[PDB]
Design a binder for this molecule. Sequence first.
Ligand SMILES: COc1cccc(-c2cccc([C@H](NC(=N)N)c3ccncc3)c2)c1
Length: 369
Amino acid sequence: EMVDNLRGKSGQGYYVEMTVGSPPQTLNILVDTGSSNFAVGAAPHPFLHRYYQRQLSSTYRDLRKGVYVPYTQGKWEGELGTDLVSIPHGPNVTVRANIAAITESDKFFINGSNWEGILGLAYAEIARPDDSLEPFFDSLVKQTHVPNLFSLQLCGVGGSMIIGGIDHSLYTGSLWYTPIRREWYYEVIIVRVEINGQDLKMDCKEYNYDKSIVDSGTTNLRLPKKVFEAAVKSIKAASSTEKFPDGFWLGEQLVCWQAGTTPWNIFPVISLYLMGEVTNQSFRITILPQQYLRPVEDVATSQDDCYKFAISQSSTGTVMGAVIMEGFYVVFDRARKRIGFAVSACHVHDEFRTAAVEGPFVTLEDCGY
Ligand SMILES: COc1cccc(-c2cccc([C@H](NC(=N)N)c3ccncc3)c2)c1
């Protein structure tokens, strides 16, 4: 019943249907592992099909507290309250949770994304205005007998969010676990990066400057400047039979090929080696160009297949975004403070290569900041 409960894409976000208030008001909500507030549009907007009308809910309680969230690309603001919340294609429960009613925003809502709010699945440490605001998943666990775990199968129906468990039909092979370094974002540690089997040969701390996170609310694989520049150099060298505009590598412009002729074989695989559950042991997640080249669907360019390079520079650490998660079944095992990865039953691949999750690997220094 929870299988296939997500819709959406890496570019615009994956979403789950939710209900807020009594009588319930149906809303589409972005599944965001990179934030911790349950924040919903609560006032009309040109990009919103519907919104939260607190006046219609008898169960709404005003917390008499404002919330202002300016971020690098834009802002959201509104006010805090609590109300009854349910996930129609999730667990069979109703919980009372904190809700940030978004009354004003700048570059937050996306035209045609089909979502009206965000379900921030990360920890209280990063909740706004401060850490006393209990995130949704914490309320769900405290109030019910739902196990403290959730899993995400993002399929480039658009995917599945399994609350309280792991669904075996969603993956193949083994689940490999990386520890959650600190409970704020879903922070992890990358120990090694290879591009077409070639080690980038950087000190492993470089990969996690200043943190590395698993974020369903970011499109791209985002890398620290030093790592990004080496990655681009290695991908350029492997795909040298074709020369693309510099705007392509900057994730600014599209690369197009006649429909059905994308030369997948000229692009390398990228392996991210994640820290294992035991000392100096690791496992690798392998990404194909089918993951790092994000198609941009547009009827006007439809004689071709056009893509954006979905690897970009970060000044805030590594972000394993939606394009990376698309290759795998990702278990957020909060109860055991660990993140599991397994090959997704829905990942996009070809007759030559498959995305992989494999290990163990042995190295004989700490890779964290
Ligand atoms: C791949 O999914 C996507 C795609 C497109 C947009 C968004 C998205 C839209 C708005 C905000 C966020 C954004 N979430 C991030 N995790 N970066 C956020 C920022 C501040 N407060 C809460 C959440 C993310 C998420």
